[PDB]
Design a protein around this ligand. Structure first.
Ligand code: HEM
Ligand code: HEM
Ligand code: HBI
Ligand code: HBI
Ligand code: ARG
Ligand code: ARG
Ligand code: ZN
Lengths: 409, 411
């Protein structure tokens, strides 16, 4: 009932009670752990309990648990639900829910910043053009000339499912991927399919290695539309090393704004299917995963050669030496151009502090160890030695099917 | 109920049916994952079934399920259990049992070698001196002058819980750790407590940074006894770098034979509390964990200074740069001295092939992602991109409480 988690480097021990308020499932069972598996309309009856659960925590957080205001609101929503078969959050509730969905994102290592989220209420939106407008504003606000500010823009909630708003891109800003005759892939292999769906939709791909994709926005259930982000609004960083002048020749660069756009935000049973959010990169995401993953830009060998390393034998650890240099370069390019970015050491140290604050002030902090530990130098970051308990709390950010596998044109 | 795991790098999908045979628990529920938690006598009543499951697995493995030899063995074992409250395993079954405990060890990335385990049957052992002799033969055999051979020595199983055989060391070979009055630690911090027990037992500590610990052996539930492993039997490797001539001057070295000796081997319900086993090292174990954990030798700074790295700000990734070098040094030193060792790339690539083979021929491969993925360069090794299912199958290697915490001293 009262679980404890120990850090094996410091011997510190925290007790977890917050998991007791766990609602959703984990994919695991007393017989099998699926901790490493990436992916382990509501009715009136289904809804009220959720709204109740939510309002309870909301009012509890504002020190008015069981107050008249609390009871009243619970009644109004209750009425509104029974009548409209749904309800609307007050702005206060929307903001609170979004911040807490971030607070509860067990896979996010940057949650120490959770309370500082800027929320853009786009619930009055009605068209793809409106969506494009809201998104551009989000992009500009959050980029802030390189001094990034976390934000989320929330489009209209789901109703009957046949009027859902959806951003087809996986991130607001991402490079394109095209399958060349060579059999090889040009650009970002991860977006090869999306890149094609834009074309299948009219986009005029410049077939480059770093082409900013176009937004494919879906409003109120209608078929999606394309819009190119004002180039002047997409901050980019040219990747150069602080010692290897040959580096720039690799012809690499990355965008400064990471902005997940394909997730679903659930607040009090309500579902917001279009809720793009952004923060700032942790160095390794680009340097380790986007650049070195075999299925991404897969650039290790190329950088290996340029460094003139004995790639004849794995045991020489050339991949490791290169990986490091590459990551020193990403953090260098960003820091030079004055674009916010955080290294895995500093980011993990913060998460640990955040975990401690969360444990004493909330009785816990759900965290997914498999995602929290950086893809490089694992054990030399504090989170590696930190036991973590993963569980689902709501409000939350959830995965949802790609729209192009659901859209009934 | 079939379960699928995908490799997000190759899009290869495997199907697991083997987890259905999983009886033991995981620590996780439908509402919580404890996948990253380090540590989440039997009665006749509970033994019969365990013995039967085992014999059934055994006889099926040899294609004699239902045979008369199978049926007679079950009758023989059950009679014996009801008769003595326990039972003895045949030699063939012990070997099969030991090999499968290794095959089922979800935290071991070296399992592609599981069928080539050399099993030393020390069930006739009765005294600590007897244990010392067995252990000495195990080390020499396994060390094989640097061309390491995986092996396990199995001492008498547990009976009433008061006559246990235990190896108090956590590994047959490990360096002493000494707490200094100024608060600093000399040697390996991980073994300070055990070192104190050895000194209290009479060991004369040479108090250096790499002193090989004595064996503390408990036979038949008696008080443990000290024994020094013959120095000529302990193979060690001086650590140097293939390009930094100052590396050797750090004065580092490590032993070549890793031999976990504090686990419990469960087979057919029987409990073998003293079952030291060894294989060969994966570089990162030494280079990353033993050398760079803040709670171990913690050499990152010193190695960083000598490299004249910019230690002013973490974002220079000086810790990362130094880490790679140290690991290159460990692998290089071992290879030069011709002592068996495997790099993390090589080891993880083999585990993937092994895992795939196991799904196809066995229906699965219980694996602990948290432990399988190496402590450095995670995503540039295939295991990181591989989804895994973790569950407990028997025979198995289990953790057990430190003996000094449970032992009833006799004087
Ligand atoms: C401000 C700095 C932030 C940092 C440094 C940060 C860091 C991270 C990192 C390293 C990941 C893993 C990314 C991956 O492997 O794909 C992650 C995941 C995640 N973060 Fe953040 N984050 C930040 C802001 C945000 C914000 C503003 C939200 C939500 C409002 C958020 C919600 C989450 C969620 C839901 C995931 C999991 C996404 C998935 O499953 O792909 N993060 N974050
Ligand atoms: C052939 C060489 C072998 C290699 C390369 C290998 C590799 C590894 C590594 C890297 C780990 C994690 C070590 C740690 O982080 O402390 C591990 C754990 C494990 N291995 Fe092996 N192994 C080998 C042989 C064996 C043998 C012979 C057995 C058993 C008969 C075995 C049983 C296990 C067990 C039970 C664990 C978990 C130990 C614990 O929880 O501390 N391994 N192995
Ligand atoms: C299979 C496994 O779940 C997958 O390869 C992982 N992906 C990720 C991870 N961690 C982060 N932060 N991001 C990922 O995409 N840990 C492991
Ligand atoms: C808390 C966390 O489970 C712990 O720090 C871990 N230890 C280990 C690990 N993996 C291996 N191989 N060995 C460990 O000791 N993964 C994580
Ligand atoms: N720090 C963030 N906000 N990350 C969002 C996900 C970005 C993704 N990991 C990438 O490298 O493109
Ligand atoms: N490859 C092995 N057999 N390892 C056994 C565990 C050794 C332990 N990790 C060490 O660094 O000493
Ligand atoms: Zn689990």
């Amino acid at each position: 009932r009262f679980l404890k988690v120990k850090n094996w480097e410091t011997d510190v021990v925290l007790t977890d009670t917050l998991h007791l308020k766990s609602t959703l499932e984990t994919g695991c069972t007393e017989h099998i752990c699926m901790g490493s598996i990436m992916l382990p309309v509501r009715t009136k009856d289904q809804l009220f309990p959720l709204a109740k659960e939510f309002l309870d925590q909301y009012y509890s957080s504002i020190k008015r648990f069981g107050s008249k205001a609390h009871m009243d609101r619970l009644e109004e929503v209750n009425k509104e639900i029974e009548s409209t078969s749904t309800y609307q959050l007050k702005d206060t509730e929307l903001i609170y829910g979004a911040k807490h969905a971030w607070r509860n994102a067990s896979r996010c290592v940057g949650r120490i910043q959770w309370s500082k989220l800027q929320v853009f209420d786009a619930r009055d939106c009605t068209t793809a053009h409106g969506m494009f407008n809201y998104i551009c504003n989000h992009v500009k606000y959050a980029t802030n000339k390189g001094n990034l500010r976390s934000a989320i823009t929330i489009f209209p909630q789901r109703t009957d499912g046949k009027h859902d708003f959806r951003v087809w891109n996986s991130q607001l800003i991402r490079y394109a991927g095209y399958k060349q005759p060579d059999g090889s892939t040009l650009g970002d292999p991860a977006n090869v399919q999306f890149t094609e769906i834009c074309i299948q939709q009219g986009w005029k791909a410049p077939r480059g290695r770093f082409d900013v994709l176009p937004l494919l926005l879906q409003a109120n259930g209608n078929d999606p539309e394309l819009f190119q982000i004002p180039p002047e609004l997409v901050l980019e960083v040219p990747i150069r090393h602080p010692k290897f002048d040959w580096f720039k020749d690799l012809g690499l660069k990355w965008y400064g704004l990471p902005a997940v756009s394909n997730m679903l935000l659930e607040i009090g049973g309500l579902e917001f299917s279009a809720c793009p959010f952004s923060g700032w990169y942790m160095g390794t995401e680009i340097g380790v995963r986007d650049y070195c993953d075999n299925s991404r830009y897969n650039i290790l060998e190329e950088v290996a050669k340029k460094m003139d390393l004995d790639m004849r034998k794995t045991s020489s650890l050339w991949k490791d030496q290169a990986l490091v240099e590459i990551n020193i370069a990403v953090l260098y390019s960003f820091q030079s151009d004055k674009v916010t970015i955080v290294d895995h050491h500093s980011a993990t140290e913060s998460f640990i502090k955040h975990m401690e604050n969360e444990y004493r002030c909330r009785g816990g902090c759900p965290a997914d160890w498999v995602w929290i530990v950086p893809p490089m130098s694992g054990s030399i970051t504090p989170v590696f030695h930190q036991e973590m308990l993963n569980y689902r709390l709501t409000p939350s950010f959830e995965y949802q099917p790609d729209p192009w596998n659901t859209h009934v044109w």
